Amino acid sequence: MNLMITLLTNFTLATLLVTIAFWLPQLNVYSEKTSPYECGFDPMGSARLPFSMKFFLVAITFLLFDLEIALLLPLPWASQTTNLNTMLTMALLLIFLLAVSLAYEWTQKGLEWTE
């Protein structure tokens, strides 16, 4: 809870920056500043319109390679046991499987479209 103490002090610092932004300097005359600005002209609607995106495979690609990051990240505790053979073998097999999946979707233009 000492890092929670640090989080508490930074929360109090951030809220005092909010209050010193809002309440101290001057007045608050609204009613045209609140209008949505794009580049000089009043546009149609707003955001939250259906915004069809370019990449489809790339976010799922990130997700699955983050999952193999999750399986690979205990490498230092891999490196200290009496079974060196299975250690090095399954480590090489996991990275080689990662490279195999990458090589498949690299050769099958899974990244060469709307990137």
Using CB under 8 A, which residues numbered 39 to 58 contact other proteins?
A: 39-43, 45-58
- To other proteins, the closest distance from the beta carbon of 22 in angstroms equals 7
Binding to other proteins (CB under 8 A) within 81-100 occurs at: 81-84, 86-88, 90-100
What letters, b where the CB count within 10 A reaches 16 and e where it falls short, cover 61-93?
Answer: beeeeeeeeeeeeeeeeeeeeeeeeeeeeeeee
16 binds other proteins per the rule CB under 8 A: no
73 touches other proteins by CB under 8 A: yes
Smallest gap from residue 19 Cβ to other proteins (A): 11
Assigned token pair, 68: 């193999």
Nearest to 105 by CA among 44, 58, 43: 58
The yes or no reply on residue 107 touching other proteins (CB under 8 A) is no
Which stretch of DSSP H or E encloses residue 12? helix 2-22
Assess 19 for contact with other proteins (CB under 8 A).
no
Site size for other proteins (CB under 8 A): 101
Task: Give least dist CB 94 to other proteins, A.
Answer: 6
Locus of tokens 């498949």: 104
Indicate whether 5 belongs to the interface with other proteins (CB under 8 A): yes
Interatomic CA distance for residues 9 and 3, integer angstroms: 10
